[PDB]
Amino acid sequence: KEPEQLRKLFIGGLSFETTDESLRSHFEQWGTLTDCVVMRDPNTKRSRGFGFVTYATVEEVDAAMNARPHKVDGRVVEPKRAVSREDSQRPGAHLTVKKIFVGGIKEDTEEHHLRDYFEQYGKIEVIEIMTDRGSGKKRGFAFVTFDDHDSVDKIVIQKYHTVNGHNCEVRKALSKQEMASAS
DNA sequence: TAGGGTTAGG
What we know:
The protein is of the alpha+beta class. 21% of the residues lie in helices and 34% in strands. It has 5 helices and 11 strands; from the N terminus they run βαββαβββαββαβββα. It has a 5-stranded antiparallel beta sheet with strand order 2-3-1-5-4. A 4-stranded antiparallel beta sheet has the order 7-8-6-11, with helices on one face. A two-stranded antiparallel sheet has the order 9-10. It is elongated and about 60 Å long. The protein has helices at 20-27, 58-65, 111-118, 149-156, 176-182, and strands at 8-12, 33-40, 47-55, 70-72, 75-81, 99-103, 124-131, 138-146, 162-163, 166-167, 169-172. The chain folds into 2 domains: 2-88, RRM (RNA recognition motif) domain (Alpha-Beta Plaits); 93-173, Alpha-Beta Plaits, CATH 3.30.70. The structure holds one DNA strand. It is classed as transport protein/dna. Keywords: protein-DNA complex, UP1, human telomeric repeat, hTR, TR2-G(11)DI, RRM, RNA Recognition Motif, DI, inosine, hnRNP A1, transport protein-DNA complex. The assembly is dimeric. Crystal Structure of UP1 Complexed With d(TTAGGGTTAG(DI)G); A Human Telomeric Repeat Containing Inosine.
């Protein structure tokens, strides 16, 4: 049995009239829903326009994501890997991005090392191992861009990543300015 | 379009 967090998808952009029932009826097409709910105001009971669906297995989750775009109650919605309440605190945790920051990679790390680990998550468009433009010294971090934002989401929700023999930290890439506003 | 009375007590 895989962890609940990894078996759940956040469903954003829900139609004003989507319900626990209409949501379920749609996503059950890709698996056994162990949970399905529409978040709404506790006071007015008005829909907050988003919800979650949870499958019995991550394979069923992958099936659902491979079926995008998803239209529910006539509205195109936005299914996303569910980011934990804890991680939802980090800056840009909910951004739709196709690039990741990979920090703490050994000096002798080469592109093939990155591909050997990251290709399993999706089509890689660009790989950039950073160096100091002036000294030419390796800075110990890289950037990897994918063709699908879900590749990035599938990655950052995992805790560990082994590249060139050792663990490395992987986060959603924030722009120069986002990093600044994040400081 | 970020969570459902779901987060520090001898």
